[PDB]
Amino acid sequence: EMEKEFEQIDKSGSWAAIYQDIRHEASDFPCRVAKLPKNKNRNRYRDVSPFDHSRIKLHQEDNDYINASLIKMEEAQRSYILTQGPLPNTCGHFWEMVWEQKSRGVVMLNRVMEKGSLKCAQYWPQKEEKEMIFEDTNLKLTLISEDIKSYYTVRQLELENLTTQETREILHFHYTTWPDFGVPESPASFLNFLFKVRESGSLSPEHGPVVVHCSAGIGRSGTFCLADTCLLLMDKRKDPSSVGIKKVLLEMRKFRMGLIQTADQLRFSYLAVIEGAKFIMGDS
Ligand SMILES: [Mg+2]
């Protein structure tokens, strides 16, 4: 039982210690493509890079590089693409990746400005009548509708491949209330958001992998994928208490470095899974 695990760590105040064991135990694989000089301006942070073996490749000949990783959770039948918040010069690459990977949903866990600094380019349109065109990748993006709620916003976007004149509907799920510092006090609104993403079909295997990002694509983004996969495994397994958060987290870190950036995010991830378990053990 992980509810017990939680009390013992919390009573002992040993979150920082747990977190360090994860750090020391985590995989390290080469990131040679990310560190090429021609890609320096495609990385928002010098210390956050995709591993070569799991990086997403753009279907480009000049430069196929984008700071994005495929997380493949085989037992759960879930795949995610985790990426950084786009830079002013990588918005076209971002939407190219969504197109090429056949994704249905984009999950955004940050605000464009936090702590007085820009964390992400404004990569979607803010008004229906002012569409965006990405000339480098030949894509057009139109805002179709926007549903603003207290904790999150959902947008319907139309992505058009100008080369083929094909169009696809993309759902943008934007969690807007993650605090500038720390983690939410309660996981309730985070879990409600996660279940809205689930209910949309965006995580389902008929579609390409959902795209998840925050600023670096490892902290908040990691919390989202970890909670979703843990809750799914507790639905699937004969023994739900066989699901270990630390084991799942180390498996995901084989695919992208640094997932879960602070001991507070680790604690929050436990809280979200524990609370979410109450709903998937059957509270209709
Ligand atoms: Mg208007």
Residue numbers in the entry: 2 to 285
Text lifted from the article:
Protein tyrosine phosphatase 1B (PTP1B) is a negative regulator of leptin signaling in the hypothalamus, where it dephosphorylates the active site of leptin receptor–associated Janus kinase 2 and decreases signal transducer and activator of transcription 3 (STAT3) phosphorylation and transcription of the anorectic neuropeptide, pro-opiomelanocortin (POMC). As such, there has been substantial interest in the development of PTP1B inhibitors for the treatment of obesity. Focusing on the variants in and near the ordered catalytic domain, we ascribed structural mechanisms to their functional effects using in vitro enzyme activity assays, room-temperature X-ray crystallography, and local hydrogen–deuterium exchange mass spectrometry. By combining these complementary structural biology experiments for multiple variants, we characterize an inherent allosteric network in PTP1B that differs from previously reported allosteric inhibitor–driven mechanisms mediated by catalytic loop motions.
Some of these variants are located near known allosteric sites: for example, D245G and Q78R are adjacent to the conformationally bistable loop 16, which is known to be allosterically linked to the bistable, dynamic, catalytically essential WPD loop in the active site. Compared with WT, D245G and Q78R significantly decreased catalysis in vitro, consistent with them having the most extensive LOF effects in cells. Somewhat surprisingly, I19V also decreased catalysis in vitro, despite having no statistically significant effects in cells. These mutations decrease kcat but do not change Km, consistent with allosteric effects from their locations distal from the active site. FoldX mutational scanning applied to multiple crystal structures predicted destabilization for D245G (median ΔΔG ≈ +3.2 kcal/mol), whereas Q78R, P302Q, and I19V had only moderate effects (ΔΔG between −0.4 and +1.5 kcal/mol). The mutations were evident in 2Fo–Fc and Fo–Fc electron density maps for D245G and I19V. For D245G, the difference features exclude the I19 area but otherwise span a similar region of PTP1B, including the D245G mutation site and parts of the β sheet and active site. In addition, D245G increases exchange markedly for the mutation locus itself, consistent with FoldX computational predictions and room-temperature crystallography. It also decreases exchange dramatically for the active-site pTyr recognition loop, consistent with D245G exhibiting the most extensive functional impacts in vitro and in cells.
